[PDB]
């Protein structure tokens, strides 16, 4: 493959997403869902990975993973 | 940066890790910890991200994230 789908937890409610090499910053939770869902519906074998920064609480990372599960990403 | 630290959940107990462009496959949980800890102690600003495959249960992804937290990765 070229480059997976990457979701980054920049803080509290702010996220960044890397789609096949292209990076998008300043995304919201509702918007991150929209994009994640659209990319997964077009490609079913898209490797999904989630990472958080050192300043983000682990509980928020769980929530992020939770949101992805809710939209059927993982 | 060049390329973050990526940990992939290939299944049940099998993991893959990508360190600055170099990918290692067939790693165990105890070994993944060793590597993750060594990379984090050398670089404190290393972006850490975790992703699981479509065939892996979400509960295992939580466990993986849990293991990283235990060794102070996130």
CB-closest option in A44, A45, A65 to B61: A65
Print the domain residue range for B17.
Answer: 1-74
Q: Could B74 and A61 be called an inter-chain contact, meaning their C-beta atoms sit closer than 8 Å?
A: yes
Question: Does B58 sit within 8 Å of A69, measured CB to CB?
Answer: yes
User: Residues B68, B50: contact at Cβ < 8 Å?
Assistant: yes
CATH number for the domain spanning A62: value is: 3.30.420.270
Q: Which residues contact B67 (CB under 8 A, 6 or more apart)?
A: B29, B32, B33
**Residue B46 CA to chain centroid, in angstroms?**
12
Domain count, chain A: 1
- Rounded to whole angstroms, the Cα distance separating A74 from B72 reads 25
Do B51 and A54 lie within an 8 Å CB cutoff?
Answer: no
Of A50, A51, A69, the CB nearest to B4: A51
**Which experimental technique did the depositors report for determining this structure?**
NMR
Walk across the sheet containing A5-9 and list its strands.
A22-27, A15-19, A5-9, A48-52, B48-52, B5-9, B15-19, B22-27
Dihedrals φ, ψ of A14, to 5°? -105, 130
């Amino acid at each position: 493959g070229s480059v997976p789908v990457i979701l980054e937890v920049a803080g509290i409610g702010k996220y960044a997403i890397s789609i096949g090499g292209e990076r998008q910053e300043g995304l919201t939770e509702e918007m991150v869902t929209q994009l994640s869902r659209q990319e997964f519906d077009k490609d079913n074998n898209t490797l999904f990975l989630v990472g958080g920064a050192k300043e983000v609480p682990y509980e928020e990372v769980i929530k992020a993973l939770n949101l992805l599960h809710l939209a059927g990403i993982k």
